[PDB]
Amino acid sequence: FQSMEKTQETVQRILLEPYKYLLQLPGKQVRTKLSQAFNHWLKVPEDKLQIIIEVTEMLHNASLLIDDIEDNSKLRRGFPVAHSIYGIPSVINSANYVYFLGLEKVLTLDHPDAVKLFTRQLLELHQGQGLDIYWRDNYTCPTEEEYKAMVLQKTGGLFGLAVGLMQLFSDYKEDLKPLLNTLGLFFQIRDDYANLHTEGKFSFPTIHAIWSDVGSFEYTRNTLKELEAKAYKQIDARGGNPELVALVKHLSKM
Amino acid sequence: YFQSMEKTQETVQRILLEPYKYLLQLPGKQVRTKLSQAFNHWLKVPEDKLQIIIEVTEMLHNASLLIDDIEDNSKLRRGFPVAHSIYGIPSVINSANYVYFLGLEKVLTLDHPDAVKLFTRQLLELHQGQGLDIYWRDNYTCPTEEEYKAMVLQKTGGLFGLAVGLMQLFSDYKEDLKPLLNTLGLFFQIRDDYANLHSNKSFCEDLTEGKFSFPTIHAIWSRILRQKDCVHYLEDVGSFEYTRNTLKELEAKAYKQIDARGGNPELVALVKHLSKM
Numbered sequence: 001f002q003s004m005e006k007t008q009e010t011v012q013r014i015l016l017e018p019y020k021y022l023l024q025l026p027g028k029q030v031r032t033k034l035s036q037a038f039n040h041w042l043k044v045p046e047d048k049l050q051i052i053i054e055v056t057e058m059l060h061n062a063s064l065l066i067d068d069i070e071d072n073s074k075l076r077r078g079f080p081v082a083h084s085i086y087g088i089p090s091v092i093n094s095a096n097y098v099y100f101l102g103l104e105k106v107l108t109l110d111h112p113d114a115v116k117l118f119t120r121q122l123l124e125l126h127q128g129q130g131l132d133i134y135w136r137d138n139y140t141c142p143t144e145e146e147y148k149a150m151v152l153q154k155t156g157g158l159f160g161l162a163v164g165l166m167q168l169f170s171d172y173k174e175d176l177k178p179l180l181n182t183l184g185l186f187f188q189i190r191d192d193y194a195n196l197h198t199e200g201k202f203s204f205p206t207i208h209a210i211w212s213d214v215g216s217f218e219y220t221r222n223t224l225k226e227l228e229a230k231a232y233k234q235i236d237a238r239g240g241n242p243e244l245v246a247l248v249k250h251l252s253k254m
Numbered sequence: 255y256f257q258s259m260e261k262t263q264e265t266v267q268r269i270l271l272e273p274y275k276y277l278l279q280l281p282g283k284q285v286r287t288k289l290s291q292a293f294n295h296w297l298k299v300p301e302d303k304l305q306i307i308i309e310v311t312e313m314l315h316n317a318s319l320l321i322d323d324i325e326d327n328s329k330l331r332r333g334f335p336v337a338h339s340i341y342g343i344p345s346v347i348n349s350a351n352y353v354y355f356l357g358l359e360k361v362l363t364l365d366h367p368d369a370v371k372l373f374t375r376q377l378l379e380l381h382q383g384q385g386l387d388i389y390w391r392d393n394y395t396c397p398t399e400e401e402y403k404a405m406v407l408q409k410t411g412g413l414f415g416l417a418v419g420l421m422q423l424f425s426d427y428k429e430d431l432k433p434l435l436n437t438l439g440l441f442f443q444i445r446d447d448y449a450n451l452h453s454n455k456s457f458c459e460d461l462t463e464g465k466f467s468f469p470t471i472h473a474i475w476s477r478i479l480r481q482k483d484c485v486h487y488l489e490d491v492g493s494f495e496y497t498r499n500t501l502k503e504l505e506a507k508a509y510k511q512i513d514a515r516g517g518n519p520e521l522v523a524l525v526k527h528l529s530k531m
């Protein structure tokens with residue numbers, strides 16, 4: 001009656017706490033820098049942007065809560081992972097609810113293909129997470145070619161959501177999927193290299209070593225620069241973009 | 255020959271659905287189907303749209319049990335080990351979540367905009383059900399009978415309303431079944447609770463399988479702060495006696511609300527059959 005509507009509204013506050021626990025962790029205020037850069041082509045409406053951002057950022061973190069459980073991570077960016085605090089069921093709930101609150105949010109774009117797209121990209125992400133666990137469960141390191149596959153499914157899976165949602169809400173229609181893989185790998189491999197120089201996570205240098213001390217760092221350096229090159233050569237054939245290339249050349253520090 | 259991505263891909267689908275399949279093969283998925291067919295005697299929906307509404311409902315159900323078992327730390331389900339104790343927590347979470355989104359994809363094929371609206375609400379609801387369940391658990395508290403019923407209509411007992419609601423989108427039938435659907439949702443659940451018990455020299459949180467069950471709750475509220483040989487204790491409290499009473503009492507209101515919607519032979523057959531327990 002009365003008491004049930006209080007006890008219910010409460011549960012929704014509670015439900016977001018693991019999601020919030022992940023928001024507050026250090027860095028990943030730099031995601032925002034990136035989508036803003038992409039808007040120098042898409043010229044998207046400020047109000048559709050804020051929702052595409054809200055969504056992307058919801059799906060991301062909900063997807064990390066699961067990824068940590070699934071990877072049996074112990075820490076994330078140095079702090080304990082969400083499940084070791086709130087506990088697995090409490091987390092599963094929060095991520096899943098947040099994913100669906102993000103559906104609800106995409107519905108507000110009022111665009112039938114946006115749900116179509118969200119659904120595809122999530123389905124993709126789950127297959128990535130799929131493989132990741134498959135390998136883990138079978139005590140197996142994936143090959144370099146397979147590692148990249150998983151990243152484009154998981155990472156290009158959720159770059160591609162955002163850039164693709166925005167491109168729905170733009171008269172810009174030239175092909176960024178090419179550029180987005182080049183960035184997806186770039187970002188990942190970099191964050192792998194940085195992180196080393198794992199937490200139950202397959203990482204580009206460890207994989208290259210394992211498929212012969214080794215100087216995978218030497219190879220990873222080489223492999224990273226080589227993408228950045230293809231970043232610029234595909235950035236240009238899309239009429240160029242100052243904001244983005246600033247954020248690339250900045251990041252090529254590591 | 256980069257048939258390597260074609261293999262690596264076909265594989266992932268097989269893998270991803272294995273825990274979902276593991277749950278299908280446990281007994282009698284033919285009884286959900288029996289029910290929605292009965293409801294079509296009012297909605298007169300197209301056979302092909304029905305099949306999808308059914309596929310969806312049935313996907314959401316099982317995916318929702320895979321999670322329920324993890325979350326309730328169940329050990330067994332319908333006698334066999336639970337899905338996660340075989341395939342393992344991460345592998346299961348993945349499969350349920352993927353299945354939920356394959357059900358989105360499926361609802362999209364109904365090609366009617368309100369269907370996504372509805373699915374999204376029902377899922378969000380389901381999660382709040384799971385919400386409550388753990389709220390109570392975390393607070394070391396047994397919920398009231400009143401509250402238990404609320405949780406059931408929110409959660410997996412809820413999932414009739416998705417289907418009947420999807421169907422009613424595709425129908426010029428517009429009279430109110432939500433009333434009848436609670437009466438049925440509780441009926442179905444409480445029955446499956448009673449059955450599950452009447453099925454050792456076991457303890458209760460063994461038999462319930464770490465689950466809130468109508469008879470155990472009624473017992474616990476009879477002999478501001480916080481609430482051997484089970485079966486005979488429950489009969490010594492006679493929750494079984496009360497559950498019998500409480501079940502029949504709904505079935506009665508099933509019939510009295512079935513009728514004020516112009517009556518329905520198919521359904522009433524399936525009720526009176528099921529009233530066996």
Ligand SMILES: O=C(Nc1cccc(-c2nc(NC(P(=O)(O)O)P(=O)(O)O)c3ccsc3n2)c1)c1ccc(F)cc1
Pocket residue numbers: 028059060063064067076077125154155156157158187188191192201202
């Ligand atoms: O891993 C994904 N994206 C991606 C790509 C490049 C870097 C990162 C990333 N990676 C992180 N560290 C590592 P992890 O995800 O194991 O914490 P990763 O490099 O192996 O993904 C962290 C940690 C705190 S914020 C963060 N962001 C994530 C990812 C996760 C969930 C999705 F739904 C989609 C992509």
